[PDB]
Amino acid sequence: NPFQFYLTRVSGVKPKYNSGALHIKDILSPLFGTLVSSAQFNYCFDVDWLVKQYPPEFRKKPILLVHGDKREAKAHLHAQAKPYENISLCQAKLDIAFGTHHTKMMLLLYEEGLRVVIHTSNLIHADWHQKTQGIWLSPLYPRIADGTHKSGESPTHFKADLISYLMAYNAPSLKEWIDVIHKHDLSETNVYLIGSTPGRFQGSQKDNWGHFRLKKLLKDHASSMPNAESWPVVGQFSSVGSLGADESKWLCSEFKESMLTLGKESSSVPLYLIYPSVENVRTSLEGYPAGGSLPYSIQTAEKQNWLHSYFHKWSAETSGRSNAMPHIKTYMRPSPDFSKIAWFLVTSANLSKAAWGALEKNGTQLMIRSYELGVLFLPSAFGLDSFKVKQKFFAGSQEPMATFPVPYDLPPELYGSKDRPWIWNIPYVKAPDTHGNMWVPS
């Protein structure tokens, strides 16, 4: 299949729904390459667990952990890694308040070449156990021969763009990986990189990151169609930031405006936001503990009740994952009848100004707090004008190269009048979950 978009394996669903899913043990398998060295970019790490996911024969190969922890949290991570002499750490600089290192990425250097994995899971058991998570697997990139001068660049500029993303860390351990990437041929890559890095971006640098990066790509490499105002926008996420006192402050002004962009010419566009309801969480495979990874706080939520009228339930019969709570984040542009999509993005970025960027300085500066990373699937990069939506995620479509595996159900279903968004720091004691328990936080 052209897209190489996968979900993680879910313990408890029928094998039909894990056939073609990937566990981390599969990604690190010798079948994928003979590992020489790896970098694991992430947010949360269980290092004992992580090393056990590598094949025994690869467990002493160098590992770089790229994280954002400071102070006591950083000390804890170093203490976790100290028993393993092959593990190095890179603390990503976070010089803007309330920023985090959320990017989930593996760089896998093999004897045979290089692989890049951009995904949505933390490196802890629970993130790969019963959650809906997304993975993009790069091709096996071969090495460029000694003395050969070629770019190794793709039509999507992915090689230079990934190097640019790494350069933003200004980190010596990552300069080594930049030099590795320089030595490999990434020309087969058919996705566009969409990253966020912390900073204040003006002028040309405005278009490098966050939602302005998405806007630039959609302007340059998608085409607008008639009735485009009728093509909805869908955002699907596991956490929500403080978006302001009403939709005009950020959500429908700059954010929706970037996501509505198509082509270079110049709103009624429906906006569907997908986020688990309390009932979604309660009846999930994990029960209420799934809400431990859906960190929407009551303090934030009570300031923006206007937002919840956009909320749609999690439903994923197409991939057998309605009870596997989402930690994947996705954004896409379906047709009015949801049979086609103009593009699809899988990313670590939740629905937050910190992740996507917020305009400052009279619209001249995009301020981003966090590191985020995703990949964008555009029909033009596959020789197509649109993608047909795959009807069943794990089935055999009549044209796999034209048919994109959307992992949850369309059309999204609006919350009912009795539904509420999952808010993780208030109690739920009216009905027990699938393990017989209530939710009593703090």
Ligand X SMILES: O=C(O)c1c[nH]c2c(NCCS(=O)(=O)F)cccc2c1=O
Both structure tokens of 424: 């993780």
Q: Which amino acid is at 177?
A: W
What are the DSSP calls for 395-419, one per residue? S--S-TTTEE---S-SSPPBPPTT-
Q: Are 164 and 214 in contact (CB under 8 A)?
A: no
Residues in the chain: 442
CB nearer to ligand X: pick between 318 and 348: 348
What CA–CA distance (Å, rounded) separates 189 from 138?
A: 7
Taking the alpha carbons at both ends of the chain, their separation in whole angstroms is: 46
What CA–CA distance (Å, rounded) separates 118 from 131?
A: 17
Provide the annotated binding site for substrate: 104, 329
CB of 297 to ligand X, least distance (A): 6
Per CB under 6 A, residues contacting ligand X are: 43, 102, 122, 293, 295, 297, 348
CB nearer to ligand X: pick between 379 and 407: 407
β-bridge mates for residue 373, sequence order:
195
CB of 29 to ligand X, least distance (A): 24
CB of 374 to ligand X, least distance (A): 12
Peptide bond into 411 cis (omega under 30): yes
Count other C-beta atoms under 10 Å from residue 265's C-beta. Answer: 7
Q: Which of 119, 211, 221, 327 is catalytic?
A: 327
CB nearer to ligand X: pick between 42 and 386: 42
CA-CA-CA-CA dihedral for 217, 234, 41, 135, to nearest 10: -100
What CA–CA distance (Å, rounded) separates 416 from 429?
A: 20
User: Which DSSP category does 298 fall into?
Assistant: H
Chain breaks in the chain (C to N over 2.5 A) after: 266
Q: Which of 102, 119, 211, 221 is catalytic?
A: 102
125 catalytic residue (yes or no): no
Provide the b/e sequence for 56-87 (b: ≥16 CB within 10 Å).
Answer: eebeeeebbbbbbbeeeeeeebbebbeebeeb
CB of 238 to ligand X, least distance (A): 7
CB of 348 to ligand X, least distance (A): 6
CB nearer to ligand X: pick between 283 and 297: 297
CB of 340 to ligand X, least distance (A): 30
Q: Are 347 and 189 in contact (CB under 8 A)?
A: no
Residue 438 has phi, psi (to 5 degrees) of: -95, 180
Spatial CA neighbour of 313 closest among 393, 385, 409, 239: 409
Q: Are 348 and 329 in contact (CB under 8 A)?
A: yes
Both structure tokens of 207: 């278009």
308 catalytic residue (yes or no): no
What CA–CA distance (Å, rounded) separates 347 from 401?
A: 22
CB of 160 to ligand X, least distance (A): 26
Provide the annotated binding site: 104, 329
Residues forming the active site: 102, 327
